[PDB]
Symmetry: C3
Subunit: 514 residues, 3 copies
């Protein structure tokens, strides 16, 4: 029940050679440099190689779990939108940043880095004309359209802290998150289209804003064009506001520990992520866990309202300068072959889905996946919950045709990027196992009965992290006490994931879950 890296992950058949490989020893050799007291040099070199800095940093890391003063590269200044848009636009403006798969397949198209950069700059200029300053919160209530990315980056361009809310959340949840983030600006659509169904996003927005006094400006994207109520003064059309603005906006120089965004967990708790550490973590996980290469076309099927959508739809892939996919539909619309039709049409090199979608597709039958070419795929990703051996085997056999590496990535919103996953070109996978910790992750197992670390293999308990990592959450927005109580107080000296986990005789990690 062991699956070595496939030939597509061995650099054969014209496929790119893996970044780390070919076996477990190479992963160990590289991972030893990323943890421990001598790991500062590796992290400094990676931060300078991966991200573009306006000012260089001096200190690599500081702080800890006990007080929630975690710092990474504090003296450096950078911009997330510069690292995700501007440098790649300068290198190659015509390269596709986003493959936008609309709800209707005929409406899908490619958005270049130039178009995405121009839209981001227009939205950033609109936000600046609204009075949005560095450190201000901007709520984003958007469906899975490509402009959402622009919206995100727009905030990241001006130093605003964006707070994304799942589209289709009720008026109460949206109101709670908007009130907690204390935003004065909300970005939303008139309506959303998903699975051939209409989401009345603007009606929900009006119902929620009836109880959100601090919101003064609403920017409304005309996604569908159907009639929606628009309050005079408060509501403005995205296209009309952006037509008045120039297609370029200067980047605000952010400290490394400036909060990049707030993401509310589904009182809602707002996990806060800073700029440089989170960006470095997601870029490195995208490059290594999925073996991304410059010409790759990443296809993550999550939602931008989720942490997976934050990391491996927007920030991670665009920081790497590769093509990412924004999928506006459901896996069974119009037909349960939608994922595979999309992969064949766009020649996706990686696929990142959730076990729930895989299970639904498996329940939908084999005729929808059996006759598809695929074969541009190299890495198949799973995230969100433990994947059963049957679902794992269906994913391997039909979506990858036994020629793609299957990565079971375990992480949370508070970890920022992937924590435990197999390296596709090095690690032999076990079905339903998140195998080994990522770079900078020193995870162990504590016995909850005694609170002591269970050394060795073939043990079971609660999963903890020994040391902070660059992409860890820094606080809970205006609720640092809750942050410390949830993640740092249960086991002092360790970060508490809250997931029961086991390590088998081979050292492989098995996440039991919450």
């Amino acid at each position: 029940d062991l699956f070595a890296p496939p030939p597509r992950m061995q650099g054969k058949e014209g496929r790119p050679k893996p970044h780390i490989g070919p076996n477990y020893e190479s992963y160990v050799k590289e991972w030893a440099k990323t943890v421990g007291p001598n790991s500062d040099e590796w992290w400094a070199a990676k931060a300078r190689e991966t991200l573009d800095w306006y000012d260089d940093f001096k200190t690599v890391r500081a702080g800890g779990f006990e007080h929630g003063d975690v710092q990474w590269f504090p003296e450096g200044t950078l911009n997330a939108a510069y690292n995700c848009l501007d440098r790649h636009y300068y290198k190659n403006p015509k390269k596709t940043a986003i493959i936008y798969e609309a709800d209707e397949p005929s409406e899908s198209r490619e958005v270049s880095y130039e178009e995405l950069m121009q839209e981001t700059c227009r939205v950033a200029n609109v936000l600046k004309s609204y009075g949005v300053k560095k450190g201000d919160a901007v709520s984003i209530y958007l469906p899975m359209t490509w402009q959402a990315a622009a919206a995100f980056l727009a905030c990241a361009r001006i130093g605003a802290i964006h707070s994304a809310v799942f589209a289709g959340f009720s008026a109460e949840s949206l109101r709670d998150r908007v009130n907690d983030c204390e935003c004065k600006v909300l970005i939303t659509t008139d309506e959303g289209r998903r699975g051939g169904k209409t989401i009345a996003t603007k009606q929900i927005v009006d119902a929620a804003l009836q109880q959100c006094p601090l919101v003064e400006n609403v920017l409304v994207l005309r996604r569908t064009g159907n009639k929606v109520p628009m309050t005079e003064g408060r509501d403005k059309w995205w296209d009309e506001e952006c037509a008045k603005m120039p297609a370029y906006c200067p980047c605000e120089r952010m400290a490394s520990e400036d909060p990049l965004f707030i993401l509310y967990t589904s009182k809602p708790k707002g996990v806060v992520h800073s700029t440089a550490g989170y960006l470095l973590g997601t870029a490195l996980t995208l490059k290594y866990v999925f073996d991304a290469h410059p010409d790759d076309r990443f296809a993550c099927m999550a939602d931008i309202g989720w942490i997976t959508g934050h990391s491996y739809i927007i920030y991670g892939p665009l920081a790497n300068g590769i093509t990412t996919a924004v999928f506006e539909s459901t896996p069974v619309y119009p037909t349960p072959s939608r994922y595979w039709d999309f992969v064949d049409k766009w020649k996706a090199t990686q696929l990142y889905t959730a076990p729930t979608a895989i299970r639904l597709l498996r329940r939908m039958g084999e005729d929808h996946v059996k006759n598809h070419d695929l074969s541009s795929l190299r890495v198949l990703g799973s995230v969100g919950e433990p994947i059963n051996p049957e679902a794992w085997h269906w994913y391997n056999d039909f979506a990858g045709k036994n020629q793609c590496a299957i990565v079971d990535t375990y992480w949370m919103t508070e970890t920022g990027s992937i924590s435990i996953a197999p390296l596709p070109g090095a690690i032999s996978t076990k079905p339903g196992s998140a195998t080994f910790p990522f770079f900078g992750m020193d995870v162990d197992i504590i016995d909850p009965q005694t609170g002591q670390v269970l050394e060795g293999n073939d043990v079971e308990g609660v999963l903890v992290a020994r040391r902070p990592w660059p992409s860890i959450a820094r606080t809970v927005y205006r609720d640092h006490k809750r942050y410390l109580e949830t993640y740092m107080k249960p086991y002092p000296g360790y970060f508490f994931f809250g997931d029961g986990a086991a390590r088998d005789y081979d050292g492989y990690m098995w996440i039991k879950g919450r």
Copy 2:
């Protein structure tokens, strides 16, 4: 009718050697490095040599005409007030930044770089106390007084976007521009003195502010000292506010593409927006090369600071170069039609930059006012604003330069930022009424309006277009980017539309027919 550069432009008679010369081939050699796909090295070298940067840039240029996302040196940070005041103050504080020629000739005096920097810092501190932030618009309604420059630079010191309004504008024009820029602070004077005449500037300001709700603070310069109405709380005297402030203010670190200023074109007036680094570089380079400016030179542009000529070649260009500039408060015919030449003789001006209207008026005023003046310190005579007739050109050459000064016919607009087509004085043989050759970074062409295609070769006529962006090009129209694109970019896709008909003769010289 060809005029080679005179001996004063040949480095002889103790005059400085020209930066570019002595003939057309040298101009071509330097210009070829400033255009095309291999010109990034030249522009990066010039940007690093001419301007002082707080942070270095990585990219030289990006963007284009189609969407209006033009970028020059985007990653670099700098300050216009630092590059126009502080570095020259550090090098030589006692050097004259401004020769202020007052309306009354006995009231004229030299303002040093130290005094100008201190005044700029006091006004910047006042504006900061008013709550003005980086990116905020500040309206300026000032006559041709030297403190106006300070006011300009004051905004540029704190990241404020200044919006200059010509002091001759009525209450309605001032109100329209002030409302469009959405400023909360207006810098103005009690009264102006031009041609012995009084401009009731504060009265017009009150009439306009009756319909300008967003303006909360008015800073009033006591220019004449006559009684004017002063609203309690809203209006404060410039001297009283500046006395409470320190004489130094820190320079705010500004991105290259941060908007330096808004200038409204004379239905709704269009606010042409200029960024900082590209515009500063363009104006400094045009000032150094088109007028052959040298460190000890005394530049005399007699335009108004309410127009782009005053923005570029009274304030930003000459002060970025660290030379003496002139602020002329009077008219060409006050007190007598010899005022220009009396000024040039008294201050030993090395360059003159006027408009064909003033030269035509002086020519109609008779030769008795110019024939008996020395004027030998002059080396370059500049004309800007409209095509200059051969008779006016010859009167300018023979009477003002005494046939010993180069005549530059500089063609450009507010949207170009700096001079686009002009003769290089030490290299180009001029033809009267001709803006001869494009400046560095300008790749101009003639397009047939009926067909829309570029008319290659010589002896062609059509509309003037620019193939590629240049550092000092306007970035947008304030809150009206659609108007910017429609006016300058959609008429001929892939090109920048000047709106001016132009012809190129057999020698390659450009002739601007005009709008």
Copy 3:
């Protein structure tokens, strides 16, 4: 009556070697480099060696007395809180930043650099949540508790100009200072404890704020825990607000000439100090005048509401990365041996007091100091007024046991740091004499009758400074005309101290005073 540097200041008996010594010639050699037209190299080297800069400076100095446009290192950017907390926290987090001697001796404890940094960052986050921006004034009405050092530095961390008011000032003085600085945020305690006595700081604050319209937020430190009135909305508890905030805050990159703080002289006149020049001056005076070394324990017993508390309790010692003492009590509480009990308990290496406290202790009798060890002491400092020969001799004989160098430091709030003092390891002292000018100080004596500088030795007149020094006051807050009239108009070309002074035949300076 001449006193050569003692063996404790000669590098003997295991004591650190003095930075400058052993005689007057060495002081002259080092001081000649710090004044004159060729002193820019020395000051540039010292600025780059002493302070951590975000951006390097190009110009060393500019401006002058006549217009009050003094500039030092204008193009450089830095942060005072970074230089006082972050770099030392990065080098050694567990080192004691503050020895907090509480009013009750049993309540005293050591605050480490990590704890001080975390408290400063929490307060900075609270202030940022109050809307405090760079350049905004924040009033501080705090007793001699260690958190005051945090509050100060919190402002310095975010570019806020802190304005400290002596605790125990009446409601009218507090109101005048708060109204003049135009602050919108006030930091104070519920009550203060000094000399076993209670100071109703919150009651005075309420009485003052009844006439301070611009104040919108009050942060109240629960120093004693006794019941005080708290206005709903306006007043919030320090601990409650700080518990919601993360323990790290990014440092605002500040221009060198950005105003660090406003200190009102006891209409109140707010002396304004910029960041880089003041920080450099205080750090250099602390290092050289007191011969501070990395492991030293500086004990300045002034008040943080005074300029001495600004320079040699908070900024100077913490910039040097050494331990500083925050003394909450009086010299005679609970007994007149409190100073010497504290010195013996914490092994203070330097003591910096005022002549009034020394005279009070001398009046209290010799039985309180005669039996104390006091061996760790090396330097004894006096500041505030001319110290009588009898008081000087008592200080030398009983507090130092004729084994400590006695430095008489003359300076004002407008000089920022010490102007005239003996270098302890080099200068032979005379009782009641501030001997020689400090680095960058070129003082002279002007005859007030004629206004001309009196050349040579054995002259008397008014003390003037020929050239600006880095730590000189830049202005009086919104009263620059008063600043010029007080300090620069009486003798054009010079800085007027306002103190009559004499120089004897040996070149020693004798300050007559106001």
